[PDB]
Amino acid sequence: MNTVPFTSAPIEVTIGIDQYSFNVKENQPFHGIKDIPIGHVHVIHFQHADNSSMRYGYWFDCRMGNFYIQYDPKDGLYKMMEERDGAKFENIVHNFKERQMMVSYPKIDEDDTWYNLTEFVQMDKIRKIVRKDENQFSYVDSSMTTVQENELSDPAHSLNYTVINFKSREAIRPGHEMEDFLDKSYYLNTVMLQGIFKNSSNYFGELQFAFLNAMFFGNYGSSLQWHAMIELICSSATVPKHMLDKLDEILYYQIKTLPEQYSDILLNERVWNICLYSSFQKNSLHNTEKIMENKYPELL
Amino acid sequence: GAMNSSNYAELFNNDIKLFVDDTNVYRVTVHKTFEGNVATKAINGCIFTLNPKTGHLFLKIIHTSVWAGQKRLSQLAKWKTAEEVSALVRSLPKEEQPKQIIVTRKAMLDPLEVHMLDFPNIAIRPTELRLPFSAAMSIDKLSDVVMKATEPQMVLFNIYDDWLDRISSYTAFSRLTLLLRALKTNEESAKMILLSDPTITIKSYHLWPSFTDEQWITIESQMRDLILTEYGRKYNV
Ligand SMILES: CC[C@H](N)C(=O)N(C)Cc1ccccc1F
Numbered sequence: 001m002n003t004v005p006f007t008s009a010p011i012e013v014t015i016g017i018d019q020y021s022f023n024v025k026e027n028q029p030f031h032g033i034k035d036i037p038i039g040h041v042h043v044i045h046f047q048h049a050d051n052s053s054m055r056y057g058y059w060f061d062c063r064m065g066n067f068y069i070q071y072d073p074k075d076g077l078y079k080m081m082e083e084r085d086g087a088k089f090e091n092i093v094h095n096f097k098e099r100q101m102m103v104s105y106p107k108i109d110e111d112d113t114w115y116n117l118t119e120f121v122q123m124d125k126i127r128k129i130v131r132k133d134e135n136q137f138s139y140v141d142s143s144m145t146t147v148q149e150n151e152l153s154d155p156a157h158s159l160n161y162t163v164i165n166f167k168s169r170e171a172i173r174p175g176h177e178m179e180d181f182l183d184k185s186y187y188l189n190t191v192m193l194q195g196i197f198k199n200s201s202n203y204f205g206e207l208q209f210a211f212l213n214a215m216f217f218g219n220y221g222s223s224l225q226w227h228a229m230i231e232l233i234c235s236s237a238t239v240p241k242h243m244l245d246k247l248d249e250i251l252y253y254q255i256k257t258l259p260e261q262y263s264d265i266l267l268n269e270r271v272w273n274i275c276l277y278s279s280f281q282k283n284s285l286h287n288t289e290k291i292m293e294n295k296y297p298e299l300l
Numbered sequence: 301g302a303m304n305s306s307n308y309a310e311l312f313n314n315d316i317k318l319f320v321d322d323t324n325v326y327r328v329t330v331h332k333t334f335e336g337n338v339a340t341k342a343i344n345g346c347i348f349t350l351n352p353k354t355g356h357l358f359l360k361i362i363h364t365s366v367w368a369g370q371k372r373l374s375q376l377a378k379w380k381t382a383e384e385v386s387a388l389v390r391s392l393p394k395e396e397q398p399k400q401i402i403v404t405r406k407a408m409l410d411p412l413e414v415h416m417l418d419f420p421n422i423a424i425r426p427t428e429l430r431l432p433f434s435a436a437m438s439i440d441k442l443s444d445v446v447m448k449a450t451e452p453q454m455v456l457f458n459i460y461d462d463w464l465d466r467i468s469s470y471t472a473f474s475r476l477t478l479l480l481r482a483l484k485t486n487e488e489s490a491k492m493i494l495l496s497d498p499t500i501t502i503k504s505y506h507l508w509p510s511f512t513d514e515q516w517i518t519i520e521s522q523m524r525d526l527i528l529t530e531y532g533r534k535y536n537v
């Protein structure tokens with residue numbers, strides 16, 4: 001079990017760690033979070049009490065380094081940093097723990113929620129979507145735009161999701177215009193899976209990462225990407241059977257975890273109605289259709 | 301964006317543009333089968349592709365053989381239309397290619413956009429206007445060449461005859477839309493109006509009669525009356 005320690009908490013802030021959140025008072029004796037499960041990526045995120053504008057956070061994997069948080073009063077945010085002195089870090093954490101200054105990651109033993117939301121998400125793929133190669137962890141916030149959003153303005157601060165565009169030459173084989181536009185299997189299986197992603201695990205990893213950035217930071221371009229990747233599968237008549245079964249599980253847990261009061265903005269009515277009721281895969285998402293109908297029968 | 305009453309003079313500027321109407325591409329007769337079920341029988345159709353500034357009409361005849369063994373024909377017809385318009389554009393010299401294509405029905409937007417991906421600078425636009433181009437098959441010479449076709453065929457017509465020697469494109473388009481609206485609302489009456497006077501003939505190379513300026517005013521007045529009459533007969537006013 002690993003630890004994300006904090007030098008202090010000088011400004012009042014709501015701190016999220018994965019799907020959990022807690023409130024820290026201004027100058028409250030707080031030195032971070034312990035008992036973080038090894039084997040998964042994690043996200044630690046922030047919303048200041050005085051400016052709910054800008055949710056921001058860091059994706060990290062404790063197997064890749066020793067990371068801590070320190071507030072910067074010049075840039076006005078909680079920054080993640082790496083401590084290269086392993087002995088120094090262990091000593092700090094041990095002292096923090098002896099003083100019961102670190103809160104406990106509230107993981108219930110029966111609970112597989114976080115695994116199920118991050119099953120295919122790898123830190124190495126995150127770092128190619130979020131480019132800042134001098135750090136082992138990745139910063140994301142509410143306002144960052146995607147490469148595709150920028151085509152339609154600072155590239156170093158962009159989310160380099162794979163561009164999907166149903167009315168593009170990449171999507172439409174010359175001579176198969178109607179075929180490829182009405183049945184996107186070519187684009188899914190040859191262009192994206194075989195060509196770009198290499199396998200369905202990398203595709204699902206990006207899909208899951210886009211959802212999580214949408215949910216935790218309200219990142220609008222990430223929401224667009226999540227829906228586009230769902231729609232590309234559902235609009236393909238020919239999808240490997242293992243992918244359909246896995247997609248149903250992925251979306252089930254995403255819909256299950258979504259805050260009820262955020263569904264209005266984070267769920268696109270057109271895509272979901274098309275995917276569940278009109279698309280080729282309208283009958284292939286039993287778990288997802290059941291939770292959507294019992295939880296959001298209004299949207300549909 | 302969409303083409304409507306507000307930006308109507310744009311049709312007659314010097315940027316090449318084409319209207320595309322797909323109404324008459326897929327045409328059927330519905331009938332009973334020996335067992336008492338209903339079936340359709342297709343008849344030849346056409347794409348109506350019109351330059352409103354010059355009157356140039358590229359009438360692509362759609363022969364019933366193009367539907368043989370195909371399913372979902374109303375959907376296929378939109379994609380076939382888009383394929384043929386794309387092929388027409390590619391056939392034209394660069395300086396004759398349109399800068400805009402205006403589709404008369406919004407369901408043509410995505411098919412045409414997808415077929416024209418190679419032409420990103422050609423704008424594909426809908427319209428809010430309710431244009432009467434479906435009545436093209438009430439023009440005798442156009443209906444005749446469509447019905448007689450035995451294979452796919454493109455036929456060229458100037459739909460304004462020689463009108464542009466005496467009137468502007470705006471006026472010609474308004475005359476065309478009036479004639480077609482009349483033919484659409486009451487074909488028999490409209491045609492009675494156009495041919496009542498046996499001394500006014502249709503030139504071999506023309507579509508419409510050789511009316512003098514004064515006779516066109518009379519004709520136009522008779523067509524307006526018809527449209528209002530039929531509007532009263534329909535609505536009881
Ligand atoms: C807002 C309730 C939150 N989801 C929760 O279940 N608890 C345990 C608060 C909490 C969470 C993490 C660390 C320390 C904490 F005190």
Ligand SMILES: CC[C@H](N)C(=O)N(C)Cc1ccccc1F
Nearest residue numbers: 022023024029030100101102103
């Ligand atoms: C930080 C969330 C809450 N405001 C709080 O004060 N907790 C729950 C007490 C606490 C627990 C462990 C370590 C440090 C702590 F301050």
Ligand SMILES: CC[C@H](N)C(=O)N(C)Cc1ccccc1F
Nearest residue numbers: 355356357358456457458459505
């Ligand atoms: C004898 C008049 C001749 N039919 C003519 O007007 N040409 C061919 C001009 C024209 C060119 C392209 C399409 C339609 C067109 F009408």
